[model samples]
Target chain A: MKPISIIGVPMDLGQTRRGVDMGPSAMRYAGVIERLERLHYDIEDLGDIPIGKAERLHEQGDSRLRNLKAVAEANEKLAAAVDQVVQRGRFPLVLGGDHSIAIGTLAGVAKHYERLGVIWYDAHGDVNTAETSPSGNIHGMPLAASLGFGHPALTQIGGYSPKIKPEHVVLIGVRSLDEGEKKFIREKGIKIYTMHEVDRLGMTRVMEETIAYLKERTDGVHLSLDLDGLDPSDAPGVGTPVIGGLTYRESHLAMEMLAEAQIITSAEFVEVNPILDERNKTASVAVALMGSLFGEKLM
Target chain B: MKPISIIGVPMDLGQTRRGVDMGPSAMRYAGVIERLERLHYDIEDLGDIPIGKAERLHEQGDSRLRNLKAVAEANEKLAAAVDQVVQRGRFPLVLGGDHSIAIGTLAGVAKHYERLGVIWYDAHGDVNTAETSPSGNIHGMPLAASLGFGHPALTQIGGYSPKIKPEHVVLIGVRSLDEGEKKFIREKGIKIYTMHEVDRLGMTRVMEETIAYLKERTDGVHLSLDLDGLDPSDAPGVGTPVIGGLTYRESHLAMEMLAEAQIITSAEFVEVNPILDERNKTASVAVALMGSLFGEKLM
Candidate 1:
C-alpha cells in the first residue's frame, strides 16, 4: 500500500442542497484520520481545496448548469492537488463535498494508467448531461463529463478530454437512474450491476464478478462511492437518497472483497450532508467502511 | 405464524438511566405497528403496562438493588399481561424499558411450555446476582433471575420457580461479561458464543449452530434481544453500550435466519434509550430488525 494523501474538497456549488460542503469536516469529526492511523497507514491530511465564492448575481452561461464557472474553477484546483499527490507516489484518498468532485479526481488519476477502471457505487447514475438533466446541478453530470460527453469546461479539467472510457466503468447499487442515464448506459454498453442484480445475485457473487471483469482489462481501478448509494435507512445523511438501496452489510462486504482483490489504487467517498444527518451517523459509517476497505479485519 | 400482540412495558425502575421508560413511545414513533402490519401478520398493539411510581426517599431494602420493590411489582403485572396474551394463543411481542423486563417476559411465557429455549442476544451476560453485581441494577440480573438464581422476588415472578433450564439457554454476542457472570456461565455449563467466537466462526456459522442446537430439544424459543448487543456505531441509543459488539448486518442476518428456522415462539426487543440516542436511529434499527425476524425479505 502507498502512503496516503487525504484531500478535502469543500465545494458544494454543484447542487442546490446546503451543508454537503461540510462533508470533509463531518468525516474528520467521525475520526477518519484516527481510523486509518490505527491501520498503520502513513497518511497526511492535506487541508481542503479552496472553493470560489458563489455569487448568485452572475448571469449563468447557458441556464442548463448552475454555478458552472465556480464548479470548474474549484475542480481545476482539485485536479492539480490530486495530480501532485499522485506525482509524489502517494495514494489520493479524497473526501468529497459532492459527487461532482469525481470529474477532478478522474482527471488527475486517469493520466497515469492507460486504461483506468472506475467503480461508480451510487443509487443514481451521475451520467446526465445538460440536455438530459432536469435540474442544472452539475453533481448529476460529473460522470458524463469524465466520459467526454458534457460541457467543454468540465470535460477538459486537466487540459484533456475523456478521462475514462465507458468500457472501463462499472456502476453498482443503482436503483434511481434518470431516463437519460439509462439511454446513455445502454448506448455505451457500460458494465452495471444495479440493485436488481445485487438482490438477485448476492453481494459475494456481485463483487467476485466485478473483480474478475476489471482485473482482466484495466491497469488501475478507482472506487467512487456515494453515500447515497446506501439505503437511506443505513446512511440517511446523504443529499439524494433512494428507498431501496444497498445495506451496510452488503457495502462492507463489497469493500472488503475489493481490498482482498487488491485492485483499488485511488478512492473517494462523497455525498454526505450533515444537515440531513442523524448525529453524524452517516459520516461515522463512511469512516467504518474506509477502515474495512483499508484491510481492518475483525479477526 | 400466529396473530401478533404488542406489549409495551414502560418500566425504567430496572436501571438507573433516565428516558428508557420512553422506549415504548420512541419505538411507536418509529412505526413498529406499521412495519409489522406491512408483513400481513394481523398485528395488534395492546398498549403499555402501567408502572408503579418510584419515590426517592424510600430505599431501605438491603441496599443491594436499586428500586427493587417497584421493579418487582412491575414484573408481576407484566407477567400477568404476557400470560393472558399467551393463553389467548396469540404470539407475544414484548417491547421493553430495559433488560430487566425480560424477567417478566420469560416468566409469563415459560409456564406454557415444558422445555422453552432462550436466546440471550446481548453484549453482556445478564447473569449477575446481587452479591456479584457491581451496580445492583436489576437490568443486569434478568437472566440470573429467569434461571431461578437471583432474589426471591425476581425468581418467584408469576409464582414459578426455574422458568427455564440451563441447557435450554443459548447466549449470543457476549463480549462484556462480569467476573461473576463468567464464573456462573462456566459452572452451569451454559452455551455461549462471545465476540471471540463470532469473529472466528462468523455470524452465518454461529446462527446455524444456534438454530440446530436449540431446535432439537426445546418445544418453543424466546428471543431476548438487547439493543446494546449491537456495536454502539450501529445502535447507540442504549443505556449501557459496549464497543466491538455485533454489527447491524450480522444482527439482521441472525433475525432473518431465525425467521426461516421458525423456532421462535415469542420475542422481546429491549434496552432502547432515546435520551442517549441520535435522532432515534437505534429505535429505527430495532424496528428494522423486527421486520426481518417477522419475515421481511429483500427479494
Candidate 2:
C-alpha cells in the first residue's frame, strides 16, 4: 500500500456553525499522526487547508445549496490538493471541516479510478438538492452534486460531470434523511445499510456485504467516515448526534475487516466537533478507530 | 462466574471533601451495571449504604484518623454487605466514596480465602497510618488499617487481625507517595510498580509480572482500582488529578489481561468524582475499563 496523505480541510463555511472548523485540530490533538505511525504507515501531515470566513449574509441565497460561492471555492482547493496527492501515488486521508468537504474529496479522487466506489458512513443521507433542502446548508447537497444531481459549481469541481455512479455508492449507518435525499437515494438505487440493518445483520455481516458489493465492479473504494455515524454515547462530539447508532466494538470490527480486505484505497474521518465533546473523547475514539482501520490488533 | 454483587458506600466522611460522597452515583451514571451486563455477568445493583451526618465540630476529633467514628461506621456496613455477597457465592464489586472503602472491602473479602492477595492500583501510597497521616483523612489509612497498623476500630473490621499481609500485596501506579507512606512502604518491603516502572516496562510487562507474582501463594486476589491511578488526561474527574498517569489504552489492556487470567475474585472502582468531569467522560471511561476487566474480548 502507498503512504497515506493527511489533509485537513478546516473549512466549515457551508453551514452557519462554530467549532466544526476545529475538527482537524482536535483529531491531531488526539494523536492521528502518532496512531498511524504505530501502524508503521508513512504518514504525511500536509497541514490544514485554509478556509475563507463565512459571509455574514442573513438572507438564504439559494435554497438548493447555501454558501454556494464559499463552498465551491473551498472545495476547489481541496480537490486540487487531493488530486495532487493521488497523482503522486499516495492515498488521501482527509480530515473534514464538515460533510460538505466531501464534494472536493470526491472531485479529486474520482478522476483516478474509472469506477470510484464510496462507502458513505454517516448518520444523515447527504443527498439533498437545491429544491429538496430545508436548511440552505451546502453541506446537505455534496452527495447530490457528486451524483450529478445538484448545482453546477459543486458537480464541476474537478472540471468534470458526476464523480460517482449511483450503483457504486453504499451508505452505512444512515438513520436521518431529508425528504429529497430519501427520494433521490431510492431513485438512484444506492445501496444503504441503516442502523436497523446494522442492528439486525451485525457490523461483521454489514462490512462483508459492503466490501463484496463495492469490490465487484469498482476500481477503488473511498471510505468517507463521519464520526456521527456512531452513537452519541460513543462519539458525542459530532455536529448532529443521533441515537441507536453503531457501537465502538461494531465500528472497530468494520474498520478491522476493511483493513483485512485491503480494499479501501483512500479514507476520510470527519464531523468531529470538539465544542460538543468531553475533553476530546470523540476525537480519541476516532484515532482508535483509525488504528483498527490501519491494522492495529490484539493477539 | 456467579452474578456480581455491587456495594456502594456513599460515605465521603473518610475525607472532608464535599463531593466524594457522590462517587457511587457517578459510577452508576457511567453505566457500571450495563457494562457488567454486556459481559454476560448477572449484576445486582445494591444501592448505597446510608451514612451518618458529619459531626458539627469545627475541628477534627482527637483520633489521628480523621472522622474515625464515621469511617468505621460506614465501613462496618460495607463489610457486612460484602460478606453477604460472598456468602451467596457472588463476586463483590464495590464502588467507592473514596479510597477509604478499601478497608471495608478487604475486611469483607479476606474471610473467603486463607491468604488473599491484593493489587492496590492508585496514584497515592494509600498506606498512611493514623499516626503518620498529614491530612488525617481516613481514606489515606486503608492499607495501614488492613495491615493492622491503624486505630483499633478500623483495624478490627470483619473480626480479623491484619486482613491482608503486606508481602501478599502489590501496588501499581504509585506516583505521588507521601514521605511517611514511602518510608512505610520501603520498611515493610511491599512490592510496588510506580509510574516510572510502568513507563519503562509498559503495562503488558507490568501485568505479566503482576500475574506471575500473585499466582503462586494466594488463594484469591482482590483488585482495588482507584480511578486516580490513571493519568488525569484520561480520568480528569478524579478527586485529585495527577499530571503523569496511565493512558486509557494501557489501562484497558491491563484489565483485559487480568480478565483473561481470571485472577480477580473481587474488585472496586473508586474515586470517580463527576463534579469536575466533562459530561461524565470519567464515568464512561470507568465503564469501558470495567468491560475489559470482566472478560469482554475484542476478537
Off by over 4 Å in 1: A15-17, A55-60, B1-118, B123-209, B215-224, B228-237, B240-299
Per-residue lDDT over B225-284 for candidate 2, one digit per residue giving the tens place of the 0 to 100 score = 989898887688887778899877578778877998899999999888887777788888
Residue lDDT tens for model 1, A167-191: 9899999988789999999998989
lDDT of 1: 0.89
- Tell how far residue B202 is off in model 2, in angstroms: 1.1
Q: Could you give candidate 2's per-residue lDDT for residues A1-299 as a string of tens digits?
A: 68989999986765478467789999999999999987888989998887876767576566456678878888999999999999999989999768889989999999999999999998888888877888868877778889888778778998997999999999998877865777898889999997657644768899999999998989999999989998887898987776447778889889999999988988999989999899999999999998898899865
Worst 10 residues of 1 chain A by lDDT: A54-63
- Per-prediction TM-score to the true structure, in the order listed: 0.65, 0.61
Candidate 2 off by > 4 Å? A1-269, A274-299, B58-60
Interface RMSD of each: 7.1, 13.3
Model 1 lDDT at residue B294: 96
Over B2-112, each residue of candidate 1 has an lDDT whose tens digit, in order, gives 899999998787435557888888899999999999999888999988888764655556456777888888889889989999999999999988789998999899999
